[PDB]
Structure formats: C-alpha cells, structure tokens
C-alpha cells in the first residue's frame, strides 16, 4: 500500500498552491515509514518534496509545525546516511599481516615489507574513518540535541488537536532517540573516544533536553552498562573511569 501513500504525494506536489498541504501529508507518510525504519521509503518521500517548498510556503501553527517536523526528518535521515557510510567503512578495516614464525630470511624480508604496507593501508583507512566519524557524530548530535525544543517536538502550541500526529511523534522520539544514542556510543567506543562516551550520561540526563524521559528503565540500564565498558577501556590506558589522569 506503500506506493499508495508515497505516490499520493506526487499529486499534492503537482499544485504549488498546495505545498503546505503536501508538506503536512508527506510528514505524516514519513512518520509512519520512520516508525518502521523504512528510510529509503521516507527518503523517497522526502525527495519528492521540492527542496524549495519551505521557502515558497512563507504562518498557521500547523504549517510552522510541519516545517520544523520536516527539518527534523531531514536531520534524522542524514544521521542514518552518514552512519551507514561510517559503518560500511569500519567493516573494510585492513587485515594485519600473517606471521610465519621461524621465517626463512626471504620470509623475513617479505614480512618487513607487508608490515610496512599494512601500516600504510591502515593509516589511510583510519584517515577516512576519522572524516566519516567526525561527520556522523555531528549528525547524531544534531538530532539528539535538536535546536529549540527537541527532535520531533512542536515549538508552536496553537495548532488544533491531532492526537494521531502528537502520539506518533512521541513514539518516534521513543524509537529513534535511544537508538541514536546507542549508535552514537558504538561510534565513540569503536574509535577510542571513551571519554566522550561517558559524557553521553551528561547529554541523556540533562534537564535541558530531558532525553531520559524517552528511555525506558531497561534502555537506561543498557546505556549505563555500555558506559561501564568504556570506563574499563579507560582504566587499561592508565586513566580513571572518566578518562581523567589519576593524580
């Protein structure tokens, strides 16, 4: 039935005078798709929305709300694009050269060479990784610390009751924020940024964004257990559990 939803958007977008309605109905379609993590689908709908719809549209609460929601969906989709790229790259990490204990002189020379080649292949890999890592962190944080009131939260209180929309959005927050926060931890921890992992406890517990309201108790426990893993790695470096030097 997907097509029925994703296609009815072509219809609404056809008529410029109907861009606000197109934005709103597209947001609705994408809210459903995002709830089932259908990002290609959502992206398929997202693109159909003329990249210039927002400018044109320019404010009833519903439209002000639709624009913000739309940017929230954009931030989310981007966080997943960058993450897929980071993920795909992380799984192309160069393989350490295999040792031939009791190498013959010829094998020692070959190994010296491969060893140095590996250090090159790996330092290049890590070089790209660093670019990708910095970018996906920026995207995650954009969603997680979404400007002016929170991701999928209306700034504008004067819209009419739409119980469906309003609870869909609370659902999205519950499905997407803890998820991002866990992905983010995987990224930080995988790339040895353990101190910043632990600062995830700041971000989540902060009254500013009140992220913890969106976590179930079980997910908070899981989060704590993950941070503990980062602490252990910091102990192995001769630091304290939060990454500070042991004075």
């Amino acid at each position: 039935e997907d097509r029925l939803k994703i296609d009815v958007i072509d219809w609404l977008v056809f008529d410029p005078a109907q861009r606000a309605e197109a934005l709103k109905q597209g947001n609705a379609i994408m809210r459903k798709f995002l709830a089932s993590k259908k990002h290609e689908a959502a992206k398929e709908v997202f693109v159909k929305i003329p990249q210039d719809s927002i400018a044109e549209i320019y404010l009833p609460a519903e439209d002000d709300n639709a624009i913000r929601e739309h940017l929230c969906i954009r931030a989310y989709l981007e966080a997943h694009e960058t993450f897929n790229e980071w993920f795909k790259h992380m799984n192309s990490v160069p393989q350490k050269p295999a040792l031939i204990p009791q190498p013959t002189f010829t094998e020692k020379v070959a190994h010296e060479h491969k060893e140095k080649k590996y250090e090159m292949d790996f330092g290049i890999w890590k070089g790209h990784l660093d670019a990708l890592t910095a970018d996906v962190k920026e995207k995650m944080y954009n969603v997680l610390l979404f400007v002016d009131g929170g991701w999928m939260v209306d700034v504008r209180e004067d819209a009419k009751e739409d119980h469906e929309r309003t609870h869909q959005m609370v659902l999205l927050r519950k499905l997407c924020l803890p998820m991002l926060c866990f992905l983010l931890h995987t990224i930080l921890h995988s790339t040895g940024q353990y101190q910043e992992c632990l600062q995830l406890a700041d971000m989540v517990s902060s009254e500013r964004h009140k992220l913890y309201l969106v976590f179930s108790k079980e997910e908070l426990r899981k989060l704590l257990q993950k941070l503990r893993e980062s602490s252990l790695m910091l102990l192995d470096q001769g630091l304290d559990p939060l990454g500070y030097e042991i004075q």
Binding site: S205, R228, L242
Partner: protein, 186 residues
C-alpha cells in the same frame, strides 16, 4: 567513595548503590568541572534506571536538580571572558560561588547584561565572608556599565531592603531610581 566502586555496582545491577557512590564522587570533585558534570549525570542516570520508589526517586532527582542549578552557573560563563582570561574550555576546576560572582562581574566580562548580574545575585546562597560586602560591589559595577538601563532591569528582575544607598555612594539618578524602587517595593 572509591573511584572503581560504581563500575562493580553497575555490573552487579546494584543501581541505587551506584547512584550513591557517583553522587559521592561528584561531591568530592573540584579539580575538573567537566568531570563533576559527568559524575552527576552518571549518578542521575543510575537513579533513573534503578528501583527507587517514585517518592524516594522524586527526592533524589530533586536534591540533584539543586546541584545541577549551581553547576549551571559555571556552565553558562560567557565565551568572551573565557578567552580573555585565557581559560580552558573544560580543562578547568570546579569554581565556587565566590570566584564565579567575581568572574561574572569582571571588567574582562564586557557584554555583562542583566542575567550575568541576576545570576550573580543568585550565587549568594552557595557561599558558606562578608555577604553584603559583595552584594553592593556588584550593584556598583552594575552601574559603571550603565554609562550614565540595566540596574533598572535587574530591579525589574527581582520581583528589596538588600540593596544599599548611603553606603553605596561612600546620585542624581540614583535617588530617582531609589524613588521608583519605593513605589515598586511598596
């Protein structure tokens, strides 16, 4: 409070205990502000993740909200004076209400507006010497910037016998304000 105790407690699913030790570590911390926040945050999560009753929990999140209020002040230090003072973003100690009030009103802190001072008058309950000595010293530099607007607004922001008059001077407009204050406080 041993620095490794919370790790073993989280691992043993003893979350109420981990909260207590994280709060403990956080209260001992003075060497790093970034660290105190992290420990506080960790402690808040352990509380939230644990099996406190809704009463007990409500208290903890409250006595925690107090602590977060204090830290919020050092947190919000303007970026203009953190550079002028050559200070370290997060690589800096846990300031006290004293060194904050002073640093929040320093002449290095150019853009000091209403809130910089309103907040400065909030960091009075977090002391534990002379109280009204600085109480004035601030209301003083709250005028030197007025370039005879703000002292007006800070009073606008209070709702009054805490302010000084005769001793402050120790004047044309001062009285003018000290007249509007009368009709305001009464």
């Amino acid at each position: 409070s041993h620095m490794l105790s919370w790790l073993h407690e989280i691992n043993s699913q003893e979350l109420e205990k981990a909260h207590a030790t994280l709060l403990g570590l956080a209260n001992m911390e003075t060497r790093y502000f970034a660290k105190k926040k992290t420990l506080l945050g960790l402690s808040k999560l352990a509380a939230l993740a644990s099996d406190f009753s809704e009463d007990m929990l409500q208290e903890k999140i409250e006595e925690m909200a107090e602590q977060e209020r204090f830290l919020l002040h050092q947190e919000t230090l303007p970026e203009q004076l953190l550079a002028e003072k050559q200070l370290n973003l997060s690589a800096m100690p846990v300031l006290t209400a004293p060194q904050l009030i002073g640093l929040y009103i320093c002449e290095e802190n150019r853009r000091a507006n209403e809130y910089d001072f309103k907040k400065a008058l909030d960091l009075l309950e977090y002391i534990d010497i002379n109280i009204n000595d600085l109480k004035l010293e601030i209301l003083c530099k709250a005028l030197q910037r007025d370039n005879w607007v703000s002292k007006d607004s800070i009073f606008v922001k209070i709702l009054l016998p805490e302010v000084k008059d005769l001793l402050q001077a120790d004047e044309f407009v001062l009285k003018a304000n000290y007249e509007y204050y009368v009709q305001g406080q009464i």
